[model samples]
Target: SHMCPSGWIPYQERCFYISHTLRSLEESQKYCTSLSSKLAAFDEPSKYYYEVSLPSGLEELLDRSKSYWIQMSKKWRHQSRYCDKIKKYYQKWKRTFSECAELHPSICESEAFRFP
Candidate 1:
């Protein structure tokens, strides 16, 4: 069977964690890496899943007015890379971009571990 680590929320064979500590995108990624995970990648399907299937408790943990750092790779502005952030609006998630040095909370994701 698959099981998530303590303090992680399980969904669709993956585990997620929301961080309350604020950090720049670089530091946020390092934090998740320390936990053997990576910053969450919110693809279209996962975006829909987050809005519709995530528990209210998790939603409430986030401040709707603030954005959280997320993982995304995009090319823009003479090869200058900008990181991504997500904000909650009503029941939907809005994606935004900013310089990586800005501080924000973050979400992490990892595959569920196996248990005997």
Candidate 2:
């Protein structure tokens, strides 16, 4: 069944749990995994193509409201800087290492995962 769990919304055969709970980026990712998922990634549909699905509603609800972690990263000068690569919702939007370590409301995403 494609139907998602209670409190989760569905898209592209996956479910997203958007929460107003505040926590660090690491904590958010951990929470998602404990629930059988991980931080959201856009590789399957490509960032531009996937975001084209919801456009404004999703951005306003999450991206612009506050910084949430996405599953993309880039190494700059031997330091890891995560990419909000969910199109970021703004031309100049960016994230910092300190920002990621600090507590903020987050979004957790899940897809049908098979475990052995």
Candidate 3:
């Protein structure tokens, strides 16, 4: 089971990816690229939920419940500052780490979790 630090279960038979972050859309793409993947773009919303995509015949390890960086704004946002000021922004729930290399192999369900 190729488990991600954030409990992202590795999925086979389709591309494995996730999308969940507070950073700007552009930065999010850059972030994923840094990991060898980009803002999961495959042509469908559910088909690519931030991260954790269905593998493509290739041996891809992924979990549906992993914490990957994605582009989000607020409770109900696609990109607008209005919701941000109204309530908790989507970015606030972004699972972050001190270092990308620290993509640990543990489940982080708390706010005080460390990557390393």
Ordered from best to worst lDDT, the candidate numbers read 1, 2, 3
- Return whichever of 1 and 2 wins on TM-score: 1
Candidate 2 overall lDDT versus native: 0.55
Q: Name the candidate that leads on TM-score.
A: 1
| Number of backbone clashes in candidate 2 | 0
lDDT of 3: 0.32
| Prediction 2 TM-score vs. true | 0.60
Candidate 2 lDDT by residue in tens digits, 26-115: 787888788788776543333432242332324446646565665544323233433343334455334333455666666667884333
After superposition, the stretches of candidate 3 with alpha carbons farther than 4 Å from their true spots are: 1-6, 14-20, 42-116
Worst 10-residue lDDT window for candidate 3 reads: 80-89
Indicate which candidate wins on lDDT: 1
Expressed as tens digits, the lDDT of each residue in 6-102 for candidate 3 is: 4333332223344444454445556666766544422222323222222332113323344443323232324232211011124222223233222
Over 1-116, each residue of candidate 1 has an lDDT whose tens digit, in order, gives 78887888776678889997999999999999998999976654443323322345455666787888877643222344577788777776666778888989998989988888
Candidate 3 lands at a TM-score of: 0.29
Ranked by lDDT, the better of candidates 1 and 2 is 1
